[PDB]
Design an enzyme around this catalytic site. Sequence first.
Site, mmCIF file in Angstrom:
data_model
loop_
_atom_site.group_PDB
_atom_site.id
_atom_site.type_symbol
_atom_site.label_atom_id
_atom_site.label_comp_id
_atom_site.label_asym_id
_atom_site.label_seq_id
_atom_site.Cartn_x
_atom_site.Cartn_y
_atom_site.Cartn_z
ATOM 1 N N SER A 98 0.915 -1.125 -0.026
ATOM 2 C CA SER A 98 0.026 0.071 0.062
ATOM 3 C C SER A 98 0.738 1.073 0.051
ATOM 4 C CB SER A 98 -0.877 0.032 1.186
ATOM 5 O OG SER A 98 -1.669 1.302 1.092
ATOM 6 N N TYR A 110 -4.012 -0.314 9.850
ATOM 7 C CA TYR A 110 -3.619 -0.901 8.492
ATOM 8 C C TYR A 110 -2.356 -0.540 7.899
ATOM 9 C CZ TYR A 110 -4.322 -1.678 3.514
ATOM 10 O OH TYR A 110 -3.981 -2.212 2.365
ATOM 11 N N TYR A 115 0.708 0.872 -4.195
ATOM 12 C CA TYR A 115 -0.454 1.541 -4.848
ATOM 13 C C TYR A 115 -1.302 2.204 -3.795
ATOM 14 C CZ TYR A 115 -2.677 -2.917 -4.117
ATOM 15 O OH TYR A 115 -3.202 -4.075 -3.472
ATOM 16 N N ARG A 152 -6.113 13.116 -5.052
ATOM 17 C CA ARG A 152 -5.775 11.615 -4.670
ATOM 18 C C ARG A 152 -5.373 10.743 -6.055
ATOM 19 N NH1 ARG A 152 -5.740 14.886 -0.934
ATOM 20 N NH2 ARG A 152 -6.193 14.085 1.316
ATOM 21 N N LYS A 188 0.998 -2.954 7.092
ATOM 22 C CA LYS A 188 1.381 -3.060 5.785
ATOM 23 C C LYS A 188 3.000 -2.717 5.609
ATOM 24 C CE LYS A 188 -0.497 -4.227 2.676
ATOM 25 N NZ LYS A 188 -1.257 -5.430 2.239
ATOM 26 N N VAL A 228 -17.647 17.412 0.254
ATOM 27 C CA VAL A 228 -16.586 17.837 -0.258
ATOM 28 C C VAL A 228 -15.555 18.711 0.925
ATOM 29 C CG1 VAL A 228 -15.218 19.277 -1.974
ATOM 30 C CG2 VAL A 228 -17.392 17.663 -2.854
HETATM 31 N N1 LIG Z 1 -8.851 -2.028 -1.065
HETATM 32 C C1 LIG Z 1 -7.824 -1.293 -0.844
HETATM 33 O O1 LIG Z 1 -7.885 0.158 -1.077
HETATM 34 C C2 LIG Z 1 -6.373 -1.726 -1.042
HETATM 35 C C3 LIG Z 1 -5.440 -0.652 -1.062
HETATM 36 C C4 LIG Z 1 -4.076 -1.043 -0.754
HETATM 37 C C5 LIG Z 1 -3.796 -2.320 -0.803
HETATM 38 N N2 LIG Z 1 -4.772 -3.425 -0.740
HETATM 39 C C6 LIG Z 1 -4.354 -4.710 -0.437
HETATM 40 O O2 LIG Z 1 -4.891 -5.739 -1.199
HETATM 41 C C7 LIG Z 1 -5.115 -6.805 -0.771
HETATM 42 C C8 LIG Z 1 -6.585 -7.154 -0.717
HETATM 43 O O3 LIG Z 1 -7.122 -6.646 -1.546
HETATM 44 P P1 LIG Z 1 -8.623 -5.932 -1.702
HETATM 45 O O4 LIG Z 1 -8.483 -4.712 -1.727
HETATM 46 O O5 LIG Z 1 -9.253 -6.548 -2.915
HETATM 47 O O6 LIG Z 1 -9.756 -6.473 -0.319
HETATM 48 P P2 LIG Z 1 -10.523 -7.819 -0.415
HETATM 49 O O7 LIG Z 1 -11.245 -7.749 1.014
HETATM 50 O O8 LIG Z 1 -11.756 -7.788 -1.448
HETATM 51 O O9 LIG Z 1 -9.725 -9.217 -0.501
HETATM 52 C C9 LIG Z 1 -9.018 -9.764 0.461
HETATM 53 C C10 LIG Z 1 -9.699 -11.097 0.505
HETATM 54 O O10 LIG Z 1 -8.812 -11.891 1.517
HETATM 55 C C11 LIG Z 1 -9.635 -12.802 2.002
HETATM 56 N N3 LIG Z 1 -9.272 -13.052 3.552
HETATM 57 C C12 LIG Z 1 -8.986 -11.993 4.461
HETATM 58 N N4 LIG Z 1 -8.493 -12.826 5.711
HETATM 59 C C13 LIG Z 1 -8.083 -13.830 4.780
HETATM 60 C C14 LIG Z 1 -7.688 -15.103 5.637
HETATM 61 N N5 LIG Z 1 -7.192 -14.918 7.097
HETATM 62 N N6 LIG Z 1 -7.193 -16.182 4.983
HETATM 63 C C15 LIG Z 1 -7.574 -16.157 3.720
HETATM 64 N N7 LIG Z 1 -8.274 -15.124 3.085
HETATM 65 C C16 LIG Z 1 -8.509 -14.035 3.898
HETATM 66 C C17 LIG Z 1 -11.050 -11.973 2.082
HETATM 67 O O11 LIG Z 1 -12.153 -13.005 2.349
HETATM 68 C C18 LIG Z 1 -11.023 -11.457 0.936
HETATM 69 O O12 LIG Z 1 -11.416 -12.180 -0.198
HETATM 70 C C19 LIG Z 1 -4.692 -6.733 0.682
HETATM 71 O O13 LIG Z 1 -3.298 -7.082 1.110
HETATM 72 C C20 LIG Z 1 -4.775 -5.085 0.992
HETATM 73 O O14 LIG Z 1 -3.971 -4.558 1.847
HETATM 74 C C21 LIG Z 1 -6.100 -3.122 -0.869
#
Ligand SMILES: NC(=O)c1ccc[n+]([C@@H]2O[C@H](COP(=O)([O-])OP(=O)(O)OC[C@H]3O[C@@H](n4cnc5c(N)ncnc54)[C@H](O)[C@@H]3O)[C@@H](O)[C@H]2O)c1
Lengths: 346, 346
Positions: B132, B157, B185, B239, B161, B225
């Site tokens: 992130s 969070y 990202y 952003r 990360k 806003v």
């Molecule tokens: N959504 C965002 O803005 C964002 C931003 C930056 C980075 N990320 C990173 O992306 C990744 C997830 O992406 P996302 O945004 O699609 O969210 P997301 O919640 O849609 O997907 C994460 C998935 O992981 C599964 N999960 C959670 N805990 C689990 C566990 N203990 N075992 C197995 N599966 C598990 C959840 O059920 C879900 O399907 C993370 O590493 C997150 O930090 C997301």
Amino acid sequence: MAEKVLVTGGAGYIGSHTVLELLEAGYLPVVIDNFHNAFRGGGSLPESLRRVQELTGRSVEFEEMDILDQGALQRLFKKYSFMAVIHFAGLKAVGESVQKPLDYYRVNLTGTIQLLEIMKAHGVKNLVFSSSATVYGNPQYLPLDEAHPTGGCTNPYGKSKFFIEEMIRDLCQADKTWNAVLLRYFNPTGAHASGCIGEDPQGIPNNLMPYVSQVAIGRREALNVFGNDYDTEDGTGVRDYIHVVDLAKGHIAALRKLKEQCGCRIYNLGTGTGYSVLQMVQAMEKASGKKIPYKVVARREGDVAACYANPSLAQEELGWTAALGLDRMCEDLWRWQKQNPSGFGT
Amino acid sequence: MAEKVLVTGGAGYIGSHTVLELLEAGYLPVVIDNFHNAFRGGGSLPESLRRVQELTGRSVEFEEMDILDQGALQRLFKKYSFMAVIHFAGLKAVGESVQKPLDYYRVNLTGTIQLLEIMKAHGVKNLVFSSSATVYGNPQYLPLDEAHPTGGCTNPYGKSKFFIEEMIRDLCQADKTWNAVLLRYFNPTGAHASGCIGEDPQGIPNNLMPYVSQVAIGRREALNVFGNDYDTEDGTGVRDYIHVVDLAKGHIAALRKLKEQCGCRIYNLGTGTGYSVLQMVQAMEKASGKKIPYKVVARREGDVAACYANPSLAQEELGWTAALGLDRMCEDLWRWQKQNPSGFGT
Ligand SMILES: NC(=O)c1ccc[n+]([C@@H]2O[C@H](COP(=O)([O-])OP(=O)(O)OC[C@H]3O[C@@H](n4cnc5c(N)ncnc54)[C@H](O)[C@@H]3O)[C@@H](O)[C@H]2O)c1
Ligand SMILES: NC(=O)c1ccc[n+]([C@@H]2O[C@H](COP(=O)([O-])OP(=O)(O)OC[C@H]3O[C@@H](n4cnc5c(N)ncnc54)[C@H](O)[C@@H]3O)[C@@H](O)[C@H]2O)c1
């Protein structure tokens, strides 16, 4: 005080000393250790605790277990009623943290997380965490105080410490009922005045004393002095050392503070005066009566001129002061060593 | 490519998209998810993956499991031969990280540690970690590049990360045979052009789009806003948003890089242009054909004027570029929503 105090990693160097101070002060400690870095005593206890009982005439409850073992933790907590937890359990050899990072993060972070979770589940929301002043990273100013930025750490050990502090802070931020005192200190040295307990010889020492001390017993030829051109009083590097007894008592002081529903507090423990390499050699000569030859070699990459803490806040809020100086540290250390050349033995 | 690619948390938003790109590109993915934040499909899979199979005509292997379950992990690894792992599994609701820090640290840190350990034990030393850009903390300069200091994070969070990145770095430092690409990202948005998959409605959105988008469907009156007095082109906050498809492909590019025994690499993924709140509203109006009324309220405490990344290095080293702009993001998002008002449903 019918309520017990849980001491994780209580068989260790700092833990054993703390356990003794707890006994002397009227507390009832329950200690857990997995023996990863402590000697197995003859009886039901580690050698360090067996000696503590002898020294105090008081007893300690002890349980062999790993903080990574959730089952063990659940049972422990069900069996005893704790008023607080003093957390010492962990890996702490800085040189080794670099070669085995995963083990550091696994034991330290995971172990801690497991502990916090069981504490939370059991309503034991009072903790004293034995931290490290290494979290301050390189001094941006001296003496280092509680307001100095943290997180500049270079090694896995240091980072793990800092990571743990952050998680504790966040938890306290989320749940106001939690009380936690984080104690930041540098290098523990010395030993109980009896000379019966102290630090066993470590594979990769975290500091200079053991080295200085080896040269004194002849178990080492001469000491290496990295640099004598620093902008210090004597040119040699300035470090922070604290007598283990003073440090163990500071842990007792933090425990009393919890009682006041202090929430999350952070304090540096130290004497407030840093010691130069030369000063330590002098101090050790005085204590040993032995000569300690040394050799100026070139300055170590990354080494800073001076690094010491300001312990004012702890005096103010915990009413704590370090009563022991350099000389006592040396004497006390020397005594334990002379008395127990090889550390513990049943 | 007889060797599989393990995708943890592959049923999620970013994961599903990545899984589709993996299929389209010729890879064989094995996905694991515990359904903590994904919809349960009718068949053997989550709804998101069932639709992916339909979309591609290709199949995915899937296993329901938790990364915190060591037994499950051992079995998984024994059953399949992985060439690499793309790690998405974790908790990622920033607002929730503040209320439930322990869960964040537990799932994210511990889960990751468990994963790394099994990878190491099985000789699978190739990883793509979905990071992130929040680790950069508040910009000390713009655009944010890979050389910007990290670790200034305010919430649990973000810190989690950053903690994970550090552990990976240290591990790579200790064992040279490891290859790891850390992708940083900001805000993922948009959805597959089909409009068949996208992000299900979240309890506490991490960004503005969903809000902008709700106002468009009338499921919300007007948009708030926060501030229109920032030193920006239009006064409103700037952003960084990236099309989920572009981001999923960047994850594919990192996988190819591993192949080159790249060791530890870090790249920011983004379009290189930040978007203002106004710009997004405009873009959404264009896409929806609907009117989006908004209200200037006062500036949010802590909010910065602009925050966007420089993705140059990724273009250079991964040969990757974001092909999708603001308009596509809006259209694509709008389409998924109109098509699937309530997200997934069997
Ligand atoms: N959504 C965002 O803005 C964002 C931003 C930056 C980075 N990320 C990173 O992306 C990744 C997830 O992406 P996302 O945004 O699609 O969210 P997301 O919640 O849609 O997907 C994460 C998935 O992981 C599964 N999960 C959670 N805990 C689990 C566990 N203990 N075992 C197995 N599966 C598990 C959840 O059920 C879900 O399907 C993370 O590493 C997150 O930090 C997301
Ligand atoms: N030695 C130092 O310089 C120093 C400096 C700063 C802070 N600290 C902190 O002090 C604490 C330990 O102090 P120490 O210096 O006396 O070292 P120590 O090794 O003598 O004691 C730690 C004890 O914990 C036990 N232990 C380790 N992993 C365990 C596990 N998984 N479960 C149960 N017990 C476990 C070890 O067997 C040992 O008895 C740590 O939190 C350390 O970070 C020490």
